[PDB]
């Protein structure tokens, strides 16, 4: 695309600059360009990709929620403008999710052989189908939800076989899968069970960790705990 003429290393460098400048749309465009170079991504590069699109779609989701709430209050006298503008933001959000899912499908996942990369990408696939499900209405809502569930489940299966229970990727996957259960799949009991089991198995493995990894793992465990406190 428009990044085809830029060096891979230059794209990564500029993604880091864009992150420092809080220019997340630029950051995502740079990382998309890096992915399209066709080489596998390092751990640091995967995190740059995730941070960029998380912030872009995060802004879209927040905007969509504001507009959706105004629209439903409008239906509890005006014309079509609120619906039109909510639809505009929704279409842009869906476009970003489709872009991320397209990168994962072409061809990040199929080249990801190590547990840390494969689980990372499958978690991302679950996440961006989950964002699609947040705005989906009706029947293809069902198929989107199942695509998220399938991606998360495959990621979970690998992480349980290949990663210790304190691994931050494994913890973040379980956190997000539990949010999927609670918010999307209308399965709060499954959400609570997953979050509790994940927390407890990580707690029993903390003794193996260095001080730095201990900090990394307990930060995500706190997120699980925060959700359980909200949910129970």
């Amino acid at each position: 695309g428009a990044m085809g003429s830029m060096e891979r290393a230059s794209l990564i460098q500029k993604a880091k600059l864009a992150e420092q400048a809080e220019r997340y749309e630029d950051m995502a465009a740079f990382m998309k360009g890096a992915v399209e170079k066709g080489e596998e991504l390092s751990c640091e590069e995967r995190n740059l990709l995730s941070v960029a699109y998380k912030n872009v779609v995060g802004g879209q989701r927040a905007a969509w929620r504001v507009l959706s709430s105004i629209e439903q209050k409008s239906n509890e006298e005006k014309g079509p403008e609120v619906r039109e503008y909510r639809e505009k933001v929704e279409t842009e959000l869906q476009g970003v999710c489709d872009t991320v899912l397209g990168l994962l499908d072409s061809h990040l996942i199929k080249e990801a052989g190590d547990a840390e990369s494969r689980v990372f990408y499958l978690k991302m696939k679950g996440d961006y189908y989950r964002y699609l499900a947040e705005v989906a209405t009706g029947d293809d809502k069902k198929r989107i939800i199942d695509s998220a569930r399938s991606a998360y489940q495959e990621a979970m299966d690998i992480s349980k076989k290949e990663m210790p229970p304190t691994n931050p990727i494994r913890l973040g996957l379980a956190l997000n899968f539990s949010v999927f259960h609670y918010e999307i799949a209308n399965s709060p009991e499954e959400a609570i069970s997953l979050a509790k089991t994940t927390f407890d198995e990580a707690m029993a493995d903390l003794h193996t960790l260095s001080e730095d990894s201990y900090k990394d793992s307990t930060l995500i465990m706190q997120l699980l705990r925060d959700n359980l406190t909200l949910w129970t």
């Binding site: 973040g172 956190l175 997000n176 949010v179 995500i220 997120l223």
Partner: peptide
């Protein structure tokens, strides 16, 4: 309902 950072 918080998701991963």
């Amino acid at each position: 309902c918080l998701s991963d950072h």
